[PDB]
């Protein structure tokens, strides 16, 4: 009952340009964008164990900007990068190339079949492509091959950069919701998630993005994200989300049975609601 | 195979600390009801925190492979010595931990001959100062024959407030051996020992359940027979985690929604079967 959009830092095949490309979206359910521009089928958001483990880790020393007075992505990006520098998340020498990347064009599904299309990219110099973990995403293989007014949006940006010493998370709640060039839907953006980092074990940045987006699509954390006045309160809410997360280990069982075994366990997990 | 989870508890009649059966695995999980019947068999679901903590303690776990012992007393002495060797516990902690590991091991049949059993902590007994209880599995599911071998895994979980950190001990015996801990005439091959103090996000019962569920999973069991280092056990655990599905809290639980996850569950299981 809100809108979340995940975009990934990529290179197209026609022009070899770096750009942000829509990869998945959330309203009631999750939809994933197929290789050639078509939306896969809606599905419940399942998460990998590693993505929640890493999300919690980067959130713990996350850079948070609450009630930020900006109305442009450029304004937000300048503020976020300054706060990243202030908290020793990135080095001042990294600022100009990250700013460049954050101000790259944001493309969408409609533009994908008019591109080559899109391939995974990594930042190295300024700002040229590299791609040095799972060539086709699980959601893409399996699912490819409702929004009223206000109705505010969450934009999740995920990008790889090898010159960064560590993966960083920026979380932004804008003072006033604002339409940005980044999102095509005329839906004002309230939240921004920025996840940047180098290649590392058990860090799939697409899945890290899916976890952040799924988190913002869940009603109780989203509410807490509106009320939060510190990083500490965001983390406490993330811990409640995890408190009420259920893990299904690999089990040799009838698939529809196994998944339906999760209902009375889950139903008991959710009260007094999550937390 | 057979996996049995036992918890360190105190009874109400004699007030002695003892090990009490809490759950068992024969491909599926059964949990021991308040007194003193087994609940219905069910697929093992796990809490996120229990796996996060299991991985953490396994990563620096104390491992004894092809351990030439055939008694619980023998294993416990070797394990505690190796716990100390790896700075997991302090030598001053050794004697009360040894005392506890050799306490009586009770089973389903004797539980109603006690007053009632509550979780206990080793000191120097006290009750958990942090807010835990009462297990989800007992509430939901509480309201045994395999030949030839069929070797058993015994999982022991205990709280001790003087330990500075939670520890995991993993033991594979050289030769399968009938002991004293487990009631079923089934030879024990593997031992899991999980000991530690109270900590946020550590439910030791759930940690025990995660260890047992992992031992009930066929690919890890194979890797556990072949492993020649901790590293090989960990590689199997990471694969187990790679193929785990996490179901987050949803405001609108829908069974139609869960069935969208069917090819995910199956594909995750497919990936697990392709690994070594």
Curated annotation (Swiss-Prot), chain A:
Disulphide-bridged cysteine pairs: none
Where is region (Dimerization arm) located? 231-275
Which superkingdom is the protein from?
Answer: Eukaryota
What outcome follows a substitution of residue 1 to E?
Answer: In Di(a)/Memphis-II antigen
**Consequence when changing residue 212 to D:** In SPH4; Boston
Localized where?
Answer: Cell membrane; Basolateral cell membrane
Which portions of this protein are annotated as coiled-coil regions? none
User: Which region ranges are annotated with the description Globular?
Assistant: 1-217
Post-translation changes: N-glycosylated.
Q: Positions modified as Phosphoserine?
A: 130
Q: Where is it expressed, tissue-wise?
A: Detected in erythrocytes (at protein level).
- Recorded consequence of changing residue 254 to R: In SPH4; Tuscaloosa
Cytoplasmic topological domain: 1-275
User: Region labeled Interaction with ANK1 — which residues?
Assistant: 121-130
Disease implicated: Ovalocytosis, Southeast Asian: An autosomal dominant hematologic disorder characterized by ovalocytic erythrocytes that are rigid and exhibit reduced expression of many erythrocyte antigens. Clinical manifestations include mild hemolysis, intermittent jaundice and gallstones. However, the disorder is most often asymptomatic.
**Annotated function:** Functions both as a transporter that mediates electroneutral anion exchange across the cell membrane and as a structural protein. Component of the ankyrin-1 complex of the erythrocyte membrane; required for normal flexibility and stability of the erythrocyte membrane and for normal erythrocyte shape via the interactions of its cytoplasmic domain with cytoskeletal proteins, glycolytic enzymes, and hemoglobin. Functions as a transporter that mediates the 1:1 exchange of inorganic anions across the erythrocyte membrane. (Microbial infection) Acts as a receptor for P.falciparum (isolate 3D7) MSP9 and thus, facilitates merozoite invasion of erythrocytes. Acts as a receptor for P.falciparum (isolate 3D7) MSP1 and thus, facilitates merozoite invasion of erythrocytes.
The text of the family note is: Belongs to the anion exchanger (TC 2.A.31) family.
Quaternary context: A dimer in solution, but in its membrane environment, it exists primarily as a mixture of dimers and tetramers and spans the membrane asymmetrically. Component of the ankyrin-1 complex in the erythrocyte, composed of ANK1, RHCE, RHAG, SLC4A1, EPB42, GYPA, GYPB and AQP1. Interacts with STOM; this interaction positively regulates SLC4A1 activity. Interacts with GYPA; a GYPA monomer is bound at each end of the SLC4A1 dimer forming a heterotetramer. Three SLC4A1 dimers (Band 3-I, Band 3-II and Band 3-III) participates in the ankyrin-1 complex.
Protein name, as recorded? Band 3 anion transport protein
Source organism (scientific name): Homo sapiens (Human)
- Gene name, per UniProt, is SLC4A1
User: Which part of the complete sequence is present?
Assistant: 56 to 348 of 911
């Amino acid at each position: 009952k809100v809108y979340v959009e995940l975009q990934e830092l990529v290179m197209d095949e026609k022009n070899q340009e770096l750009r942000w490309m829509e990869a998945a979206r959330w309203v009631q359910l999750e939809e994933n964008l197929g290789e050639n521009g078509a939306w896969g089928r809606p599905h419940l958001s399942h998460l990998t164990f590693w993505s929640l483990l890493e999300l919690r880790r980067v959130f713990t020393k996350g850079t948070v900007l609450l009630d930020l007075q900006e109305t442009s992505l450029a304004g937000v990006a300048n503020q976020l990068l300054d706060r990243f520098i202030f908290e020793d998340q990135i080095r001042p020498q990294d600022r100009e190339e990250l700013l460049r990347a954050l101000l790259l064009k944001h493309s969408h599904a409609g533009e994908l079949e008019a591109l080559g299309g899109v391939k995974p990219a990594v930042l190295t110099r300024s700002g040229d492509p590299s791609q040095p973990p799972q060539h086709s995403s699980l959601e893409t293989q399996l699912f490819c091959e409702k929004i009223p007014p206000d109705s505010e949006a969450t934009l999740v940006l995920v990008g790889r950069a090898d010159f960064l010493e560590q993966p960083v998370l920026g979380f932004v709640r804008l003072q006033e919701a604002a339409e940005l060039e980044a999102v095509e839907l005329p839906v004002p953006i309230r939240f921004l998630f920025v996840l940047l980092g180098p290649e590392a074990p058990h860090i799939d940045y697409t899945q890290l993005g899916r976890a952040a987006a799924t988190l913002m699509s869940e009603r109780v954390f989203r509410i807490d994200a509106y009320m939060a006045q510190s990083r500490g309160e965001l983390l406490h809410s993330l811990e409640g989300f995890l408190d009420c997360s259920l893990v299904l280990p690999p089990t040799d069982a009838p698939s529809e049975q196994a998944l339906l075994s999760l209902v009375p366990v889950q139903r008991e997990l959710l009260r007094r609601r999550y937390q």
